[PDB]
A paper describes a structure:
[name]-M-15, which belongs to hydrolases (EC 3.5.2.6), cleaves lactam carbon–nitrogen amide bonds rapidly, deactivating β-lactam antibiotics.
The crystal structure of the apo-form [name]-M-15 was obtained at 1.8 Å resolution with three molecules in the symmetric unit with the unit cell parameters of a = 170.6 Å, b = 50.9 Å, c = 106.8 Å, β = 113.23°, in the monoclinic space group of C2. The structure of [name]-M-15 was comprised of two domains, α-domain and α/β-domain. Thus, association of compounds would gain entropic contribution by replacing these molecules.
Numbering used by the authors: 25 to 288
Amino acid sequence: PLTADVQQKLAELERQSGGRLGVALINTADNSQILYRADERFAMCSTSKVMAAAAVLKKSESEPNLLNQRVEIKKSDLVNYNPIAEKHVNGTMSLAELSAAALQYSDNVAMNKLIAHVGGPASVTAFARQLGDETFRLDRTEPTLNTAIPGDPRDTTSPRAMAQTLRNLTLGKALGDSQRAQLVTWMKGNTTGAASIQAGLPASWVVGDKTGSGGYGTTNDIAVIWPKDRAPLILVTYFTQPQPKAESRRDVLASAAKIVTDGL
């Protein structure tokens, strides 16, 4: 935990931001958590790509290769945002190249290839289950899993659920030592995440995160944080709005992060 005014400031942030806000922070220094609306369901949008690349990483631990297995990219595979796979159409990408592209560039084509390889949404969910996450559910594919319609449980998780699941994956032992590091390597290389959580933390703090955008102004970010001379933090910030066509609010997440790391 922290103080009585974090919740007041969070609710202030929420009300003034014109939406709905979910937060879960874990401080590995003392296993204190800050939790705002952290038991309500939020639409993961591209944050779900962490569960995909990680579900594969686990498989690599019982398939001495796998991560180099090449995967065909086809013209019919293409969806709105594919910054990487567009360069290997009629070619191949290994599962590592795909995970890499999905995590660091939010490559929607990549994401679908990850879902495909692990047997579809339900088997990504079953992966979260075996990690002790009984909340995460992935139900659809790129691009539809980002609809983020209010009331709709599909492709949601809770901030508590995902902060803990993320802690296990990136810091704990949900993965092998070398898979864990690899997941950390990919997150730390994310290209897209600067205006979000990271904008709310001391400039000198080191961030590996995955943002997520979607319908209804849904702006999300999930992050592992290594301050110099501290123990690391898990911070999960979900935010969504009422207008179907609202613009993203990356700064609401940064503001969230400044609030829940004040005094650290």
